[PDB]
């Protein structure tokens, strides 16, 4: 009986802590992903405007 | 029919589209008696689920012609089962992202297929990394 | 009726209406055999929505005012499109079927529905 | 002796609980990390879309 | 003529669907009897708990010989339903030869009858007329045969094959072991999967999307505990002996109703 | 106010209108039920039932099974049951004669069991028809 509860508690805490550590890491991945996405969106917006200005100029031609 | 069928194609196309030509041949017959057998084992079903996705690749919007590399890349993605997970209404929106991803992030793939004109091992690997990268991005 | 010609929003609704209408036509033989209760919960709905859509398609005409007496309604292309969204999105599921019949605008059906409820209550 | 027996049994039961406690804590850590990673990705995607739409 | 044929076949399809709906209603009508019976048959086992009790229907004897009763459709023009059953019947007869334990076939329905008439290199116990709208009258003559045949030790482990109505598009034959009734009341197939008898699923046909489908859904029927002050009129072994035929009769009727 | 009866066959619930008295056969031989009866469970032999409610009491022959009787309530599980009025007596008698004739011929260890249980079946049909 003693060897069981301890193992459960050992294993259990290794696992809660591990799960929350993973949460942190993701909190990290997402955090990273959000920054990348934001930059990509800005560039894409830039894409649209730039190319449409090119299209304008061609229309003027 | 094309009488001059494959002396016409480029080397990347002949390799890539060799798979494709067969899968549609399977899928003409697996769509036959699909409702007759009607409890589809995964030997028939996954080849039938592969088939519907294969048909989606053939779909295109009017007056938006694809470059040879895109076609080679698109055919390849579909044949391998990469798009099997995706919803049928998700396939056409995915591939458009994957092509745009590849022009933007990985322009080495276009340089291989336009110069060597052969579906090189370097080229094949180079696509996969975009597919893994692109697939991960699409999910979120 | 192509999306590049009529716009994406108009095309989706038109396609959906045909599908909903098409399913109802297929289901008519089935409904007689199994009845409306025996159908599944999706097909209690696409039968009901199809009935409302059928009624919504019918409209009072300016020319027929002499013959029927009810005033006709010229209905815009936007008021048509907005109307079949509210039927197919299910936000008007509670209304009776004869509130959609011979009305012009989507608002008229709701207005007609409310008046019917008041009359029924009376 | 009775106290000694109790002490040893409690020490063992407590060890099991703590081991059970640790396992749950690690599961929570993993879940939180997974949720956080998702936020990053999804968040950025949304941002670009909204930003991409505005640029367009 | 082709247009006329199309109208006729369409009418036939509609009529068949209506008949299937009627069959579903029929199965539902007999639900109180099988719900009440399995509630009794559970509580008669949980009260019994006695080694000295042996009932003839459940009595187990060496499987020297086996009786297989074949429940086929009455008429033609129904896909491969009859062909599939007889073809599946053959595998069971073939399988017995590998074991060599002397099959015997009770055939139900006309296409099964006309099959085993023209092939005489099989024994037949009896030829039964098929029937639409099967009744407890008509399952009794099946039951009076099989029960009588089984109690005598000539045949053992009587098993029945028929098609559980699983799907419209496909309905594969399944073979169950009728006798000797399990005292737990569990009903199980020859292969070796036994469902608890308390839970069974009726088949209800509903439309999924546009198409007409069927979904077999199981509602478990809980068995309320027997009254504490309950008094058994005969003997628990004796009361149970009367009960088993009702269960066998009820089962044969469902096997045939489902096949129909 | 009274006990209530539901007799039910494997396909068809026959009698579910409620009564002041019934009296049914069983394997012990005979039993009677009156309202607020103690909870009993009897295996019922094939042979006629007699049920009295109010003015009128009538026999439907039923073909054996099980009968439990709970608080304020009877339910009878029988594999086949017929109302004795709805069977026409003479035809039932003719059937009984046929059964007897076949029994007299019928021979061998299973077969007689079938003959005997069939003649037992047939003989009880007229006994509800006459009564």
UniProtKB/Swiss-Prot annotation, chain A:
Superkingdom of the organism of origin: Eukaryota
Purpose: F(1)F(0) ATP synthase produces ATP from ADP in the presence of a proton or sodium gradient. F-type ATPases consist of two structural domains, F(1) containing the extramembraneous catalytic core and F(0) containing the membrane proton channel, linked together by a central stalk and a peripheral stalk. During catalysis, ATP synthesis in the catalytic domain of F(1) is coupled via a rotary mechanism of the central stalk subunits to proton translocation.
Subunit (UniProt): F-type ATPases have 2 components, F(1) - the catalytic core - and F(0) - the membrane proton channel. F(1) has five subunits: alpha(3), beta(3), gamma(1), delta(1), epsilon(1). F(0) has four main subunits: a(1), b(1), b'(1) and c(10-14). The alpha and beta chains form an alternating ring which encloses part of the gamma chain. F(1) is attached to F(0) by a central stalk formed by the gamma and epsilon chains, while a peripheral stalk is formed by the delta, b and b' chains.
Comment field (misc): In plastids the F-type ATPase is also known as CF(1)CF(0).
Residues of the full protein shown: 63 to 123 of 184
Subcellular location: Plastid, Chloroplast thylakoid membrane
Descriptive protein name: ATP synthase subunit b, chloroplastic
Family the entry assigns: Belongs to the ATPase B chain family.
Swiss-Prot record, chain B:
Location in the cell: Plastid, Chloroplast thylakoid membrane
Similarity section: Belongs to the ATPase alpha/beta chains family.
Record's subunit section: F-type ATPases have 2 components, CF(1) - the catalytic core - and CF(0) - the membrane proton channel. CF(1) has five subunits: alpha(3), beta(3), gamma(1), delta(1), epsilon(1). CF(0) has four main subunits: a, b, b' and c.
Known function: Produces ATP from ADP in the presence of a proton gradient across the membrane. The alpha chain is a regulatory subunit.
Protein known as: ATP synthase subunit alpha, chloroplastic
Origin species: Spinacia oleracea
Full protein stretch here: 364 to 503 of 507
Curated annotation (Swiss-Prot), chain D:
GO molecular function list: ATP binding; proton-transporting ATPase activity, rotational mechanism
Protein location: Plastid, Chloroplast thylakoid membrane
Single GO BP term: proton motive force-driven ATP synthesis
Keywords, in A-Z order: ATP-binding, CF(0), Chloroplast, Hydrogen ion transport, Ion transport, Membrane, Nucleotide-binding, Plastid, Thylakoid, Transit peptide, Transmembrane, Transmembrane helix, Transport
One cellular component (GO) term of this entry: proton-transporting ATP synthase complex
Function of the protein: F(1)F(0) ATP synthase produces ATP from ADP in the presence of a proton or sodium gradient. F-type ATPases consist of two structural domains, F(1) containing the extramembraneous catalytic core and F(0) containing the membrane proton channel, linked together by a central stalk and a peripheral stalk. During catalysis, ATP synthesis in the catalytic domain of F(1) is coupled via a rotary mechanism of the central stalk subunits to proton translocation.
Note: In plastids the F-type ATPase is also known as CF(1)CF(0).
Family: Belongs to the ATPase B chain family.
Protein name from the UniProt record: ATP synthase subunit b', chloroplastic
Lineage, uppermost ranks: Eukaryota, Viridiplantae, Streptophyta, Embryophyta, Tracheophyta
GN (gene name): ATPF2
Full-sequence range covered: 112 to 167 of 222
Swiss-Prot record, chain E:
Family listed: Belongs to the ATPase gamma chain family.
Location in the cell: Plastid, Chloroplast thylakoid membrane
Record's bilayer topology term: Peripheral membrane protein
Keyword Cell membrane: no
Disulfide links within the chain: 188-194
GO molecular function: proton-transporting ATP synthase activity, rotational mechanism
Protein name (database record): ATP synthase gamma chain, chloroplastic
Keyword presence, Chloroplast: yes
Active-site residues (renumbered): 78
Other known facts: Alkylation of Cys-78 results in the inactivation of ATP synthesis.
Quaternary data: F-type ATPases have 2 components, CF(1) - the catalytic core - and CF(0) - the membrane proton channel. CF(1) has five subunits: alpha(3), beta(3), gamma(1), delta(1), epsilon(1). CF(0) has four main subunits: a, b, b' and c.
Domain of life: Eukaryota
Organism, scientific name: Spinacia oleracea (Spinach)
Modification after translation (UniProt): Disulfide bond; Cys-188 and Cys-194 are known to form a disulfide bridge in the dark which gives rise to an inactive enzyme. Activation can be brought about by a ferredoxin-dependent reduction of the disulfide bond in the light.
Functional note: Produces ATP from ADP in the presence of a proton gradient across the membrane. The gamma chain is believed to be important in regulating ATPase activity and the flow of protons through the CF(0) complex.
Included range, full protein: 53 to 312 of 364
Keywords, comma-separated and alphabetical: ATP synthesis, CF(1), Chloroplast, Disulfide bond, Hydrogen ion transport, Ion transport, Membrane, Plastid, Thylakoid, Transit peptide, Transport
Cellular-component GO terms for this entry: chloroplast thylakoid membrane; proton-transporting ATP synthase complex
